[PDB]
Amino acid sequence: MIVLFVDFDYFYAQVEEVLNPSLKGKPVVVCVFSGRFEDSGAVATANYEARKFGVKAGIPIVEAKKILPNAVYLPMRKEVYQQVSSRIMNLLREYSEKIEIASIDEAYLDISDKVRDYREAYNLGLEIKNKILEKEKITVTVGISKNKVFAKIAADMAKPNGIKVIDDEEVKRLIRELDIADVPGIGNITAEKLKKLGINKLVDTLSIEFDKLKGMIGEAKAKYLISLARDEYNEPIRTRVRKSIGRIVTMKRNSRNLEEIKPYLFRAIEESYYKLDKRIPKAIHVVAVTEDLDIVSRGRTFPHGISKETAYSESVKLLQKILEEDERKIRRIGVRFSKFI
DNA sequence: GGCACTGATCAGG
DNA sequence: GCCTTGATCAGTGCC
Ligand SMILES: Nc1ccn([C@H]2C[C@H](O)[C@@H](COP(=O)(O)OP(=O)(O)OP(=O)(O)O)O2)c(=O)n1
Ligand SMILES: [Ca+2]
Ligand SMILES: [Ca+2]
Ligand SMILES: [Ca+2]
């Protein structure tokens, strides 16, 4: 099997440069402002000119400005990026009907039936890069290997504006030498659990007793890692379907007052139904982010679709449930809908 | 024993 | 900050 993975470079910031080419060569930081005070919010992404100096996704805007006070700080325009992304995704469908759109800026193509070997695959990857550059003036990185996991590791290694193949021999090398923390799906908490077991490379998971592994990180991740170490991971490229759609808004001030919270909750419902478009959910969850930033949620599933009127009345009941069962003040409040008809 | 369902967790974009 | 193109866990009700 041959998998080609495409990952768009510094995507949000790059779209902003395409739309305003005077930004080219300047550090650009795309921000999500929460509106609680001035410059409250977090960085969504930054282009490489900013990232070079430590301005990275997730950090506080105030922290970014301490590092690069003269960078260009732009508000996130996700609707614009989403529309640009959709156009590029339509470009990719021309190269394979087996395509898995994995997020707003990534896709997997199964090109098993389009090329014979890694040489032809590399050439097709070049063709894809040039096409997206030609039509949308966006640069991407391409990773190619025998499965989705190594195709992604390949792209990680070639970023930015690159292309890389991980052939069968290199796959065997990585199983021995790749830092296990760098395997997709292994986050800090799991990486720490593993280190405490002495596992530092995929190969190590083959010699440890399975129940030990499973007891620490769970059955699913244990099997996942072992399948990879044995060079036996194969998951097909699958069409992804949206399963939940929601909106969460930050309140001006932390509160436990129902009447205070309601106007924000109802705004989240309005925006959520807008995003639902033609989908009709049978389930609704109210989702509260506490002051200490924990997340608490309560839901309700109906044997029928939920009208916006039913969303309003049920959401208040669920929020009350949350207030009844947790005593912390709420900082953000929202809803998420799912189980579409 | 194991399926179906919930809310919490961990992950990653 | 915000979103799920999320999956999996423990706890449970149930057959
Ligand atoms: N914590 C994060 C990470 C990413 N994103 C958004 C903005 C990114 O542009 C996009 C893609 O994520 P990458 O993780 O693919 O980021 P870039 O595409 O920004 O960087 P790179 O060139 O390393 O791929 O998703 C976000 O909102 N919040
Ligand atoms: Ca990217
Ligand atoms: Ca990405
Ligand atoms: Ca990691």
PDB file of N, CA and C (backbone and C1' of nucleotides) in Angstrom, chain A residues 102 219-220 240 243 246 248 250 275 336, chain C residues 1-10:
ATOM      1  N   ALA A 102      -8.626  14.905   6.889  1.00  0.00           N
ATOM      2  CA  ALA A 102      -8.405  14.640   8.298  1.00  0.00           C
ATOM      3  C   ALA A 102      -8.498  15.879   9.175  1.00  0.00           C
ATOM      4  N   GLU A 219      -5.689  -0.554  26.615  1.00  0.00           N
ATOM      5  CA  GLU A 219      -5.643  -1.574  25.591  1.00  0.00           C
ATOM      6  C   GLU A 219      -5.433  -0.968  24.188  1.00  0.00           C
ATOM      7  N   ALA A 220      -6.238   0.020  23.813  1.00  0.00           N
ATOM      8  CA  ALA A 220      -6.196   0.560  22.449  1.00  0.00           C
ATOM      9  C   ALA A 220      -4.824   1.089  22.078  1.00  0.00           C
ATOM     10  N   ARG A 240     -14.173  10.659   6.192  1.00  0.00           N
ATOM     11  CA  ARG A 240     -14.600  11.099   7.523  1.00  0.00           C
ATOM     12  C   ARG A 240     -15.939  11.853   7.446  1.00  0.00           C
ATOM     13  N   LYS A 243     -19.427  14.503  13.117  1.00  0.00           N
ATOM     14  CA  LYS A 243     -20.209  13.820  14.123  1.00  0.00           C
ATOM     15  C   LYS A 243     -20.683  14.757  15.225  1.00  0.00           C
ATOM     16  N   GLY A 246     -20.519  22.482  17.459  1.00  0.00           N
ATOM     17  CA  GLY A 246     -20.751  23.196  18.699  1.00  0.00           C
ATOM     18  C   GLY A 246     -20.098  24.553  18.686  1.00  0.00           C
ATOM     19  N   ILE A 248     -18.543  27.432  21.880  1.00  0.00           N
ATOM     20  CA  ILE A 248     -18.332  27.797  23.262  1.00  0.00           C
ATOM     21  C   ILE A 248     -17.810  29.222  23.303  1.00  0.00           C
ATOM     22  N   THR A 250     -16.557  32.606  25.750  1.00  0.00           N
ATOM     23  CA  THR A 250     -16.025  33.078  27.020  1.00  0.00           C
ATOM     24  C   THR A 250     -16.920  34.189  27.551  1.00  0.00           C
ATOM     25  N   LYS A 275     -24.194  26.879  12.231  1.00  0.00           N
ATOM     26  CA  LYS A 275     -23.153  25.960  11.769  1.00  0.00           C
ATOM     27  C   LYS A 275     -23.695  24.578  11.392  1.00  0.00           C
ATOM     28  N   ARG A 336     -22.904  21.612  22.307  1.00  0.00           N
ATOM     29  CA  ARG A 336     -22.425  20.802  21.197  1.00  0.00           C
ATOM     30  C   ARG A 336     -23.561  19.880  20.819  1.00  0.00           C
TER      31      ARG A 336
ATOM     32  P    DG C   1      -8.292  33.053  27.230  1.00  0.00           P
ATOM     33  O5'  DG C   1      -8.583  33.073  25.658  1.00  0.00           O
ATOM     34  C5'  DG C   1      -8.139  32.007  24.846  1.00  0.00           C
ATOM     35  C4'  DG C   1      -9.018  32.010  23.627  1.00  0.00           C
ATOM     36  C3'  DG C   1     -10.357  31.307  23.847  1.00  0.00           C
ATOM     37  O3'  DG C   1     -11.260  31.846  22.883  1.00  0.00           O
ATOM     38  C1'  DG C   1      -8.954  29.988  22.460  1.00  0.00           C
ATOM     39  P    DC C   2     -12.841  31.513  22.960  1.00  0.00           P
ATOM     40  O5'  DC C   2     -12.992  30.245  22.017  1.00  0.00           O
ATOM     41  C5'  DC C   2     -12.733  30.489  20.663  1.00  0.00           C
ATOM     42  C4'  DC C   2     -12.686  29.164  19.946  1.00  0.00           C
ATOM     43  C3'  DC C   2     -13.816  28.187  20.328  1.00  0.00           C
ATOM     44  O3'  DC C   2     -14.430  28.204  19.076  1.00  0.00           O
ATOM     45  C1'  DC C   2     -11.685  27.113  20.112  1.00  0.00           C
ATOM     46  P    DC C   3     -15.759  27.371  18.781  1.00  0.00           P
ATOM     47  O5'  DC C   3     -15.204  25.986  18.181  1.00  0.00           O
ATOM     48  C5'  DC C   3     -14.651  25.971  16.876  1.00  0.00           C
ATOM     49  C4'  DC C   3     -14.139  24.582  16.593  1.00  0.00           C
ATOM     50  C3'  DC C   3     -15.164  23.489  16.908  1.00  0.00           C
ATOM     51  O3'  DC C   3     -15.456  22.906  15.653  1.00  0.00           O
ATOM     52  C1'  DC C   3     -12.982  22.969  17.770  1.00  0.00           C
ATOM     53  P    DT C   4     -16.719  21.916  15.483  1.00  0.00           P
ATOM     54  O5'  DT C   4     -16.084  20.453  15.742  1.00  0.00           O
ATOM     55  C5'  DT C   4     -15.074  20.032  14.782  1.00  0.00           C
ATOM     56  C4'  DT C   4     -14.420  18.704  15.113  1.00  0.00           C
ATOM     57  C3'  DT C   4     -15.383  17.570  15.516  1.00  0.00           C
ATOM     58  O3'  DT C   4     -14.977  16.469  14.767  1.00  0.00           O
ATOM     59  C1'  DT C   4     -13.607  17.751  17.055  1.00  0.00           C
ATOM     60  P    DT C   5     -16.024  15.337  14.348  1.00  0.00           P
ATOM     61  O5'  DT C   5     -15.342  14.642  13.084  1.00  0.00           O
ATOM     62  C5'  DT C   5     -15.043  15.394  11.909  1.00  0.00           C
ATOM     63  C4'  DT C   5     -13.827  14.878  11.140  1.00  0.00           C
ATOM     64  C3'  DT C   5     -12.480  15.074  11.834  1.00  0.00           C
ATOM     65  O3'  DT C   5     -11.976  13.837  12.309  1.00  0.00           O
ATOM     66  C1'  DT C   5     -12.401  16.024   9.625  1.00  0.00           C
ATOM     67  P    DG C   6     -11.056  13.799  13.624  1.00  0.00           P
ATOM     68  O5'  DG C   6     -11.961  14.549  14.720  1.00  0.00           O
ATOM     69  C5'  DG C   6     -13.204  13.931  15.034  1.00  0.00           C
ATOM     70  C4'  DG C   6     -12.672  12.698  15.703  1.00  0.00           C
ATOM     71  C3'  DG C   6     -13.615  11.572  16.078  1.00  0.00           C
ATOM     72  O3'  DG C   6     -12.866  10.439  15.673  1.00  0.00           O
ATOM     73  C1'  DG C   6     -12.456  12.452  17.971  1.00  0.00           C
ATOM     74  P    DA C   7     -13.419   8.948  15.905  1.00  0.00           P
ATOM     75  O5'  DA C   7     -12.387   8.342  16.970  1.00  0.00           O
ATOM     76  C5'  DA C   7     -11.002   8.355  16.670  1.00  0.00           C
ATOM     77  C4'  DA C   7     -10.309   7.792  17.880  1.00  0.00           C
ATOM     78  C3'  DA C   7     -10.960   6.503  18.388  1.00  0.00           C
ATOM     79  O3'  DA C   7      -9.940   5.536  18.713  1.00  0.00           O
ATOM     80  C1'  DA C   7     -11.001   8.211  20.072  1.00  0.00           C
ATOM     81  P    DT C   8     -10.335   4.082  19.294  1.00  0.00           P
ATOM     82  O5'  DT C   8     -10.163   4.250  20.874  1.00  0.00           O
ATOM     83  C5'  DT C   8      -8.930   4.699  21.422  1.00  0.00           C
ATOM     84  C4'  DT C   8      -9.115   4.859  22.920  1.00  0.00           C
ATOM     85  C3'  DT C   8      -9.773   3.670  23.642  1.00  0.00           C
ATOM     86  O3'  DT C   8      -8.983   3.465  24.806  1.00  0.00           O
ATOM     87  C1'  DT C   8     -10.865   5.685  24.227  1.00  0.00           C
ATOM     88  P    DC C   9      -9.060   2.085  25.644  1.00  0.00           P
ATOM     89  O5'  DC C   9      -9.548   2.572  27.101  1.00  0.00           O
ATOM     90  C5'  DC C   9      -8.687   3.509  27.770  1.00  0.00           C
ATOM     91  C4'  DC C   9      -9.296   4.078  29.034  1.00  0.00           C
ATOM     92  C3'  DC C   9     -10.087   3.061  29.853  1.00  0.00           C
ATOM     93  O3'  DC C   9      -9.459   2.792  31.113  1.00  0.00           O
ATOM     94  C1'  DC C   9     -11.417   5.030  29.392  1.00  0.00           C
ATOM     95  P    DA C  10     -10.010   1.603  32.060  1.00  0.00           P
ATOM     96  O5'  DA C  10     -11.058   2.334  33.023  1.00  0.00           O
ATOM     97  C5'  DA C  10     -10.630   3.379  33.868  1.00  0.00           C
ATOM     98  C4'  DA C  10     -11.840   3.883  34.625  1.00  0.00           C
ATOM     99  C3'  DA C  10     -12.510   2.821  35.481  1.00  0.00           C
ATOM    100  O3'  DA C  10     -13.047   3.453  36.615  1.00  0.00           O
ATOM    101  C1'  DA C  10     -14.032   3.567  33.825  1.00  0.00           C
TER     102       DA C  10
END
